[PDB]
Each structure stands twice: as C-alpha cells, then as structure tokens.
C-alpha cells in the first residue's frame, strides 16, 4: 500500500554535480518525487561557435542524475511547456514495463504527465527520450541522462566490505552529428524541425562531428574542472546513451569499476581504461594519491583531443615522491 | 572408441527458432549429426527493395543454431550443390584445430564433406564461412551462424544454482555493406562474382549500409515478433560474426548475461545493455514481469532505428501496477 | 629508502619477443633500469609500399614490452636525440601522478630525462607519447607500447592456483590514418611536420586506412610467424593505445583471458573472442592442443583481412583425431 509510504521531494542540480543523498539508507522505502521540465534550446557546443538545437531534460546536457535506493518508488512529473515544438517522452532503463515508461509519458507541448515505477535493481542506468519514429534524433540532440539506484546498504567491494565515497560527479558523454554542407561546413537552422532530414543523413554516417562531456568542448575545464583532494574517495558516474566509450583517468586508475554499472556484480579492480557500451551507465571509484591536474578522457584519443571528449580534475594536496619522481629533469 | 557411441541425427530449424534439445543431458556423450546445405540466393533486405546476393547456410541469415552438450562430438555433413557459384567452407569457433575446421571443409560447387569435432568447451560460439582470400566477403554476405554447447548439467547462476529456460530464441545480427554509386544509390548485380571489387571497397569504409536481425529490416516484427508470457524464462542467444553490438531489451533487463557467451564463467547480473564483441556469441536470460510490446535492439540507436537492428517481443499476461503505473496520464 | 635497493639494468628486445624475466620474483623489490631512445623514421606499412613518418620508442612499432614485478620501481632513461624533429614525452598508464609521467618527461631533440615511478598495481598497461596539443598524432604514428607488472608470486587462475607460461609474445596493434588525396591515393611527405594538418583531417574521419600488428601488414607471417609446440602454454599480451580491438585465435581459444589486463581480477575462461578497449592492454593464456597454422586476428574481419590486423602462429607436434577429424574429405 503505497499511500502509507513516506514521500520525499528532491530538487535536482545541474551536472556534473549531484543532488544530496544518503549512501546507506536512513529510512525504509519511500516514494521519491522528482520534477523535470523539458527545454528545447540553442546550444553552442565548440570553440568555433557551432550551434545546435538541443533537446534537454531540465535545461542541461546531460540531464540531471537522480539518486534513489533499491525498492524505492520513483515518481516523476514530466513537463513539456508550450514554448517547445516537439513531442517528447522518457524511457528509464532502470524500470520494468511499457518500453521503460516511454509508452506512458508521451507529452505534446502544453502537456504534463506523472509516472511512477519501482526501482527493483541496483545500479546506474541511462534514461532517455524515445518518441516513436524519432528515437535517435532526440537522444543524439542531448535528451538523455542517468539514474543511480543505490543498494540499501550502500556500495561494496569485491569482498563485500563497504566502499564509501566522499564525492560524486556525473559525466554525461554526448555524440553529436551536426549536418555539413558539400565543402564540410556545419549548417544552421532556425527551428529543430527544419534540421530533421539533414540530421538523419548525418546520423547515418555513424561518424560524430563532436563528442563532448557535459554538453560542450571544454565544459569540464578551467573554472569548471572537477575538484578533489589527495586522500579523497571519488565516484564518477559516466553515461553514454548511444555510442561506446572507454573512460580513462590520466595519471590515475579506476580502483573499483562497474563498467556496465550494476552493483550486484563485483567491481573490476585496478582498471586503466574500461568500456561503457552505448546505452549504458558505468561507475568508477578512485582514491586520489597525488596532487595536480588530471585529465579524464575517452581513450580513443582522437575522440578525446580532436572531437572534444576530455575534461580535467584539479587535485590539491601533498606530492608523494615514493610513487613518482623526476630523477633527472629534461636537459641536454 | 567413437564407434561405440550413440549417434543421433538432428533436423535443424529456421532462426529465430531453435531445434528441440534437452537442457540437462539425459544420455551420455553422443555423436550428434547435422546436415547443412549451402544456398547462394538473392535476398531483399529492406523496405525499399534493396537486393543482395546472400551466401547462406541452410537458406537463412543467420544460419541455424546447433545445440549439443559438452563432450559430445559434432559431425557435420556440409553440402555445396552445383547450383552455387563459389567455393565455401566452415570455421567453428567451438572447435580446436585446423582453423576451426576451415582447412578441412573447402567445397567447390558439386562437392560435400563431413567434419567431426569434439565440443570441449561449454558456451555459445559463432560459426562462419572463411575461404582463403575472401573471408570478410562471405561473412558479411550472411554466411554465419552459431552453436550452443550446453554444460551436461545445464545452466547455472552466479551461486551455482540451476537456471532453466522455458523458451530460447536465436537472434543473428548481420552487418551488410551494399555498394553504392556516386550519388549514393545501391547497386545491383546478376551474380555474386560481379559484385566482388565493389564489395571490397564498400567493406573498407567500415560503415555498414544495413544492420539487421534475422536477415532483413523488420524481420522480427508483426506476425514475426518473438513471443512470451509473463512469468516465462527466456534465453536469447545473440551472435555477431564481424562487428560489435550492444543488445538491450526495451522495458526489461538481462537478468543473467554471458556477454561473451562462455558458461564456465559466472553471468553478469541485472544488465541494462551488454557488449557482444564482433566474432562472438552471447546469451541473456530474462524472466518477463510485464505484458506488452518490448523492443530488442542494438543500443547504438542509429544502428537500431535507422539501419535496421531492432525487433519486437509481444508478451501476454497480467499488468503489475506496483512495478510501473501512470499516476497522471498526459494532459494539459 | 630507495638507495639501499638492488638496481638491475634490463636490455629490451624488439617485439614480438620479450626480454628475459622471472615469473615468480626471486629477489625482493628492486629498481629496474630501462633505457629507451626515441627514433622518428620512415616506415613502409603495406605491400603497395605506402610510407609514413613513424614516431617510435626504440625503433619499433610497437615499443618494447617492459616487465617488472609489483612494488618494483621503474627508472626509465628517455633519450630524444638531435636527429629527431619533434618534442616527445611518455605517459605510463601503470603509474600514478603527473599525467602518468607525461608532465615530467617532455624532451626536445637533444635532451634526455630519467623518470622513476613505483609499480603499485599488477597487470599489463599501455604506455604512450602524449605531448600537449599533439596527443593522437604521436600515438597513431606508432608511439606506444606496454609494460607488464607481474604479481610477485606470478599469475593465478580463477581458483588461485599457479598458471605458468612457457612462452610470451607481445602483439601491439596499430591504427594508422594515412592522408589521402581527392581520388583516394595516399600522400607522401618529406618530414613529419609537413603531414600535420592532413594527419588531423584523416584522424577526424575515425576511419583507419591500415590496422596492423607489429608495424606492418604481414609482419607476423612467413619467417616471422609466432611459434609454439603442442602442449606449450603461451601468453599473448595485446595492446591497442587508441581503438578497440577484439582478438581471436583461429583454431583455438583464450583459455584464460584478462581482457582489460589487470591481474588482481579473475580471468575469463574459454573465450572465443574478447574485447580490448582502446587505451588498454590485455593478456590471453592458451595451451596448444593441435599442430598446424593458426591465425591470430582482430575479429572485425574487414580490419583483419582487408586492413591488415592478422598474424600467424606455426605450431609443431602431433595431430589429435579425437578433437577434430575429416570423416569424408571434400569430394563430388
Ligand atoms: O531554441 N530552441 O531550440
Ligand atoms: O505544460 N503543462 O502543464
Ligand atoms: O556504438 N558505437 O560505439
Ligand atoms: O566507438 N565508440 O566510440
Ligand atoms: O554491470 N556490472 O558492473
Ligand atoms: O541467386 N543467387 O545469388
Ligand atoms: O553436392 N554434392 O554432393
Ligand atoms: O568491430 N566493430 O565494432
Ligand atoms: O561498433 N559496433 O557497432
Ligand atoms: O564469456 N563469458 O560469458
Ligand atoms: O625519417 N624520419 O621520419
Ligand atoms: O640526447 N641527449 O642526451
Ligand atoms: O575506439 N574505437 O574502437
Ligand atoms: O572499433 N574498433 O575496432
Ligand atoms: O582487467 N582485468 O582483466
Ligand atoms: Cu525528446
Ligand atoms: Cu534505451
Ligand atoms: Cu562461403
Ligand atoms: Cu572467426
Ligand atoms: Cu612523441
Ligand atoms: Cu593514455
């Protein structure tokens, strides 16, 4: 009887940050209430000023990370305001039935809907838009995110002992297929609808024009670099709704990795690079041991350094010469 | 001494169906006899009427699934009738030695051969044609299938308890590279031999023109949708002989997945999406919990919804509102 | 106190061979000293005589495999002689901090540097060049290799029992992106610097022109085929610094596979084909059971047989008819 369960309302935050939550559940099962508003907006995705018509959940690419516990109910109010132009919906890979909820959430502009589902399996999972006949166009326009379903007793290592993270970040990786004219210049449209047949032809090449973290080339750099301190335990959730990716922390490792994101499985240890298949979310746990700048990339290095799939951590603290040292600095 | 072993003759059925077999072996080791006839035929692969010259085992793409138990002998009579034009052979990834049998099975039109091999390792494995100098052309013309080698005591979960399936389907996923003229229209040839140098150039782009389940866009839909009932336990075997794939059941999960198909390993649990590397067969076990239409796709959504890698399940039974429900239907 | 530790100097050998080492450590922790010299050279990569300007560690593509034990220190003297034209450095995925050492090893021509790092995690790992702003160009010009960090008590199976290899080979797989003119012919340049903007445009297609083992089409064939004997236990280390690969031994299996290369994890058993994500090294252990020629390929068969990712083993010994036999040889 759901009506006897506590209801909690959560306000979502913008990626790469994650809304406040408890790792080990401090209550019994709850109905966890989220609201998301769909926003179609123009987005500048690179340093050259290339613009697309992005389709978003809550104004960001990716959509925000939702965090619940195993056997909570998720109740999502989904709003499509009348300033949008397209029909949208939502499919949760965490959920069971009705095309992940996609069959029950089709909202024209000016409509809203409320879906509830039980979070029966622990893990990180992708959610994304999936309207009949226009699935890849919506997804590769940025209409995807993830949800983390924590076990009620939090995360465990390969021997079943607790793993507690100090910080958590969400990296959404987006493949874009910007249409190009004959000479290779990117095209521009006034509405999303205008772009449709060009977008399909661009997708059909299977060759993205941009691959980015958090919606743009250089989004996780400079003043927007991820931060940590030496000795901190950091969980990085990474999703790709459409295309394989192979994350790698330059200068570090994935101490404990759930590459396909499902926490009833033991983690893989000591990973250099791991594969997150398209349509999956994964999670990697690392404890920082050295200060400095680290780069977090897709380790297809062309995708990283030419197409944009690279961000930075800035880590503060004490240098440990036992782990690495320059014996003779570069010299003639 | 093989001559003292029982011999059983099996008649194969067309994918996605699988020939009758026992999960737990009810006899000791046997010689299991199969016959396959090679058929080169014209195949229409999409709704536009694009035709290729397909090269098949037993008239289908994929070839039929063969099922034996660990430490059975497989004896295959392979027939290349004189109505075909090409030399063919067979390589079993389940087998040991002679290029998986490819070195011993080279048959010109008008020839036949009988190979025997011992099935020493449990798992699902790919088989495919592999003639010297023309390997990828034969494979990507549809000349591949799979064989399942069950452990003698059937399948086990991660804790070694029995997993029994009620139904089993075989999904063969095929990447085609149809040659194109200057403007982008698909070419047509009278014989397979005519297409050869154009086929190579098309393969070299590494970009398929079509990716399909069971030989055509829409083959596993409509009256050809896969069926199940709520409460049924379904094993889906999925092979890709040449290119990576990332299957996903929309609205469900892979409860127990052997993504690289080898049953001495524990399954991965609770998968949303899994990676089957090209040249591999994998297997996923799911118990249906909700009725309705489900889509089974490659979760590169362009490959699924534009290039054709999508099929349907139709599941009958009772709706469970506790798992999912529409709280407020779409409305203004 | 490092100054009290034994120092051992190792001379590296050319791939696919590996320098002499002990599987089970016969001493305590040591400082293991390696020297590598950077060589920029012209390389002929295919049977047509296509030439590139390769950037190498120690004159080979890949760079040599380095072998140490867990909790050894690696001290690398890296030399960039004044006959080279570019700035280079080295990033070890085995190491912790400073961008894997890349931040501390930037050497102009005429310079050298000595880096030391502690090998804290057991596994095979990629190393590669990674100069600021030119990372993928250096890597896809062949400037990568691997390092194996053995556990102090050698390798273990899934039940923790010793696995001892009789032989070890290193296969480095290289994706090249040779620029092409309008008609599709490969271009030629006098210096590496000349090629730069054409190289970027070629990389951006995400479509390699060649994928090769040990630096050239056909490098691991003929008199350069890998050898073994029936009954021998062979470890094959396989690295790909930039792009996914799916190795497969035609006629055999991966008995024990660490597909992502990290030895604290149990191996996957009985693999037909496995996925090594780009930016990773993996390792596969096989015991040969049949004599003959075997092909070791990337099982995207186009990448193998058209683009060049294929080599051979030649195995000597006795044929076992129980495992495979031709019952009726090909005949009318
Ligand atoms: O500004 N809407 O794409
Ligand atoms: O956007 N209508 O609630
Ligand atoms: O699905 N492409 O990695
Ligand atoms: O191929 N996926 O980056
Ligand atoms: O999907 N297990 O990480
Ligand atoms: O009809 N034979 O391709
Ligand atoms: O096709 N000859 O048996
Ligand atoms: O081998 N291509 O996924
Ligand atoms: O890249 N394989 O779909
Ligand atoms: O290959 N083991 O699923
Ligand atoms: O010959 N140096 O590229
Ligand atoms: O190349 N200078 O040591
Ligand atoms: O990163 N390409 O497999
Ligand atoms: O897609 N990697 O071969
Ligand atoms: O990464 N473990 O094979
Ligand atoms: Cu949408
Ligand atoms: Cu999906
Ligand atoms: Cu054939
Ligand atoms: Cu094969
Ligand atoms: Cu370099
Ligand atoms: Cu790297």
User: Binding site annotation covers A55?
Assistant: no
Q: Is A104 helix (H, G, I), strand (E, B) or coil?
A: helix
B217 to chain A, any CB pair closer than 8 A? The answer is no
- Beta-carbon count within 10 A of A279 CB: 31
CA C133, C137, C142, C148 dihedral sign is positive
- Convert chain B into a string of H (helix), E (strand) and C (coil): CHHHCCEEECCCCCCCCCCCCCCECCCCCCEEEEEEEEEEEEEECCCCCCEEEEEEECCECCCCEEEEECCCEEEEEEEECCCCCCCECCEECCCCCHHHHHHHCCECCCEEEEEEEECCCCEEEEEECCCCCCHHHHHCCCCEEEEEEECCECEECCCCCEECCCEEEEEEEEEECCCECCCCCECCCCCCHHHHHHHHHHHHCCCCCEEEECCCCCCCCHHHCEEEECCCEEEEEEEECCCCECEEEECCCEEEEECCCCCCCCCEEEECCCCECCCEEEEEEEECCCCEEEEEEECCHHHHHCCCCEEEEEEECCCCCCCEEEEEEEEC
Please tell me the total number of residues recorded for chain C in this structure.
332
Tell me if C260 sits within 8 A of C277, measured CB to CB: yes
Minimum distance, in Å, between the CA of residue A217 and any CA atom of chain C: 15
State the sign of the Cα–Cα–Cα–Cα dihedral C32, C38, C43, C46.
positive
Which residues pair with residue A258 across a beta bridge? A283
**How far apart (Å, rounded) are the C-alpha atoms in residues C180 and C203?**
11
Rounded CA separation B309/C114 (Å): 52
Distance between CA A274 and CA A271 in Å, rounded? Answer: 7
Bridge partners (DSSP) of residue C238 are C171, C282
In 3D, which of B56, B65, B57, B50 has the Cα closest to residue B16?
Answer: B65
What's the Cα-to-Cα distance from C146 to each of B198, C127, C263, C293, rounded to whole Å?
A: 38, 5, 15, 27
Q: Determine contact, residues C113/A331, Cβ cutoff 8 Å.
A: yes
Which residues, in sequence order, are CB contacts of B58 under 8 Å at separation 6+? B12, B14, B36, B37, B39, B64
Give yes or no for a cis peptide into B178 (omega within 30° of 0): no
Q: Which ligand is nearest to the CA of B38?
A: 18
User: Taking CB atoms and an 8 Å limit, are C116 and A320 in contact across chains?
Assistant: no
Q: Is the dihedral of CA B193, B197, B198, B204 positive or negative?
A: positive
Tokens standing for residue C95: 């190491």
A93: three-class secondary structure by DSSP: coil
Q: Is the peptide bond before B62 cis (omega within 30 degrees of 0)?
A: yes
Contacts of B272 (CB under 8 A, 6+ apart): A93, A94, A123, A125, A126, A260, A261, A262, A279, A280, A281, B248, B253, B254
Both tokens of residue B62? 């994929």
Q: Which two tokens stand for residue C275?
A: 């996925």
Ligand 10 atom closest to residue B267's alpha carbon, by position in its atom list: 3
C-alpha C162/C-alpha B195 separation (Å) is 52
**Token reading at C117:** 């790092």
Nearest to A201 by CA among B183, C200, B140: B183
Which residue has tokens 């086929």?
B199
Q: Is C211 on the interface with B (CB under 8 A)?
A: no
Q: How far is the CA of C107 from the centre of ligand 12 (A)?
A: 9
Closest Cα partner for C110 from C90, C85, C73? C85
Ordered by where they begin, the domains of chain A are 1-151 (2.60.40.420), 152-318 (2.60.40.420)
Query: B139: phi > 0 → left, psi -120 to 50 → alpha, else beta; which?
Result: alpha
Smallest CA-to-CA distance from A125 within A258, A279, A16 is with A279
Nearest to C97 among A295, A323, A329 (CB): A323
User: Is A210 an active-site residue?
Assistant: no
* Structure tokens that stand for C2 in this block: 């490092």
**Per-residue buried b or exposed e for C71-84, using 16+ beta carbons within 10 Å of the residue's own CB:** bbbbbbebbbeeeb
Measured in angstroms, the resolution is 1.8
Residues counted in chain A: 332
Residues 6 or more apart whose CB falls under 8 angstroms from that of B207 comprise A205, A206, A207, B177, C207
Edge-to-edge, what's the strand order for the sheet holding A91-92? A65-69, A144-150, A123-128, A91-92
Question: Residues of B numbered 136-165 whose beta carbons fall under 8 angstroms of chain C's beta carbons: which are they?
Answer: 136, 139-140
Strand partners, C147: C66, C125
Distance CA C48, CA C84 (A): 27
Q: Is A112 near ligand 2, meaning CB less than 6 Å away?
A: yes
Pairing between strand C7-9 and B324-331? unpaired
Do B251 and A97 count as a contact with CB atoms less than 8 A apart?
yes
Instruction: Name the maximum alpha-carbon separation found in chain B.
Output: 77
How far is Cα A82 from Cα A75, in angstroms, rounded to an integer? Answer: 22
Q: Is the distance from CB of B54 to CB of B142 less than 8 angstroms?
A: yes
CA distance A49 to C110: 40
CA distances from residue A107 to A84, A85, A143, A146, C260 in whole angstroms, order as listed: 11, 11, 14, 20, 43
**A190: which 2 tokens?**
């006034």
CB of A196 within 8 Å of any CB in chain C?
Answer: no
Of A272, A294, A300, the CB nearest to C126: A272
Closest CA to C123 of B131, A254, B313: A254
Residue C103 token pair = 């931040």
Measure the CA dihedral A91/A93/A97/A100, to 10°. Answer: 0
Beta-carbon count within 10 A of A27 CB? 12
Closest CA to C173 of C124, C235, C239: C239
Cα angle for residues A281, C302, B121 (degrees, 5° grid): 70
The tokens describing B63, both together, are 């070839």
This structure was determined by X-ray
Q: Do B175 and B211 touch, CB atoms closer than 8 A?
A: yes
Q: Identify whether the C-beta of residue A76 lies closer than 8 Å to the C-beta of residue A90.
A: yes
Residues in CB range of C8: below 8 A, 6 or more apart: C30, C31, C32, C33
Q: Helix, strand, or coil here: A136?
A: helix
3-state secondary structure of A296: strand
Q: What is the dihedral of CA A211, A217, A219, A225, to 10 degrees?
A: 90
Q: Residue B103's CB: how many other CB atoms inside 10 A? A: 19
**How far, in Å, are A18, A118, A252, C295 from residue A152 at the CA level?**
18, 14, 29, 49
CA dihedral B162, B164, B169, B175 (to 10 degrees): -10
* Residue A305, SS3 per DSSP: helix
Please name the residue of chain B whose CA is at the shortest distance from the CA of residue C267: B265
C284 touches chain A (CB under 8 A): no
Alpha-carbon distance of B316 to B227, in angstroms, equals 8
Count the residues in chain B. Answer: 332
Judge if the beta carbon of residue B315 lies within 6 A of ligand 10.
Answer: no
Report how far residue A122's alpha carbon sits from residue A92's, in angstroms, rounded to the nearest whole number.
13
The size of the A-C interface in CB pairs under 8 A is 162
- Distance (Å, rounded) from C-alpha C67 to C-alpha C94? 12
Cβ under 8 Å to C: B residues 2-41: 2
Instruction: Please tell me the distance from the alpha carbon of residue A24 to that of residue A166, in angstroms, as a whole number.
Output: 13
The set of chains that have 3 or more CB pairs under 8 A with A is B, C
The 3 state secondary structure assigned to chain C is: CHHHCCEEECCCCCCCCCCCCCCECCCCCCEEEEEEEEEEEEEECCCCCCEEEEEEECCECCCCEEEEECCCEEEEEEEECCCCCCCECCEECCCCCHHHHHHHCCECCCEEEEEEEECCCCEEEEEECCCCCCHHHHHCCCCEEEEEEECCECEECCCCCEECCCEEEEEEEEEECCCECCCCCECCCCCCHHHHHHHHHHHHCCCCCEEEECCCCCCCCHHHCEEEECCCEEEEEEEECCCCECEEEECCCEEEEECCCCCCCCCEEEECCCCECCCEEEEEEEECCCCEEEEEEECCHHHHHCCCCEEEEEEECCCCCCCEEEEEEEEC
Two tokens at C240?
Answer: 């790909």
**Residue C268 distance to chain B (closest CA, Å):** 7
CA distance A96 to B255: 12
Short-list C271, C245, C244, CA closest to C256: C271
Contacts of C201 (CB under 8 A, 6+ apart): C179
Give the pairing type, strands A73-80 and A111-118: antiparallel
**Sheet with C210-213, edge to edge strand ranges:** C210-213, C167-176, C233-240, C280-287, C254-258, C268-271
What spacing in Å lies between the alpha carbon of A91 and ligand 5's midpoint? 20
Give the minimum alpha-carbon distance from B102 to chain A in angstroms, rounded to a whole number: 32
Taking the Cβ of residue C326 and every Cβ of chain B, the question of whether any pair is shorter than 8 Å is answered with yes
Say which residues have a Cβ less than 8 Å from residue C229's Cβ, sequence separation at least 6.
C288, C315, C316, C317
């Amino acid at each position: 009887d759901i009506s006897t369960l506590p209801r909690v309302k959560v306000d979502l935050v913008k990626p790469p940050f994650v809304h406040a939550h408890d790792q080990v559940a401090k209550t019994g099962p709850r109905v966890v209430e989220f609201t998301m508003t769909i926003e179609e907006k123009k987005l500048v995705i690179d340093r050259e000023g290339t613009e697309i018509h992005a389709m978003t959940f809550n104004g960001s690419v990716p959509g925000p990370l939702m965090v619940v516990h195993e056997n909570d109910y998720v109740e999502l109010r989904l709003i499509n305001p009348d300033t949008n132009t397209l029909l949208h919906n939502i499919d949760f890979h965490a959920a069971t039935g009705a095309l992940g909820g996609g069959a029950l959430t089709q909202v024209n502009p000016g409509e809203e809907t409320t879906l509830r589902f039980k979070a029966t399996k622990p893990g990180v999972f992708v959610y994304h838009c999936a309207p009949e006949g226009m699935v890849p166009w919506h997804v590769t326009s940025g209409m995807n995110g993830a949800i983390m379903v924590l076990p009620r007793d939090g995360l465990k290592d390969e021997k079943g002992q607790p793993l507690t993270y100090d910080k958590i970040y969400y990296v959404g990786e987006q493949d874009f297929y910007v249409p190009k004219d004959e000479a290779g210049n990117y095209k521009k449209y006034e509405t999303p609808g205008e772009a449709y047949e060009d977008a399909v032809k661009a997708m059909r090449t299977l060759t993205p024009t941009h691959i980015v973290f958090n919606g743009a080339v250089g989004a996780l750099t400079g003043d927007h670099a991820l931060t940590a301190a030496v000795g901190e335990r950091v969980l990085v959730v990474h999703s790709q709704a459409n295309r394989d990716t192979r994350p790698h922390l330059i200068g570090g490792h994935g101490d404990y990795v759930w590459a396909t994101g499902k926490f009833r499985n033991p983690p893989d240890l000591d990973q250099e690079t791991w594969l997150i298949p398209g349509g999956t979310a994964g999670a990697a746990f690392y404890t920082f041991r050295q200060p400095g700048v680290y780069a977090y990339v897709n380790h297809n290095l062309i995708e990283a350094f030419e197409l944009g799939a690279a961000g930075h951590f800035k880590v503060t603290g004490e240098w440990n010469d036992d782990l690495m040292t320059s014996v003779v600095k570069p010299a003639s």
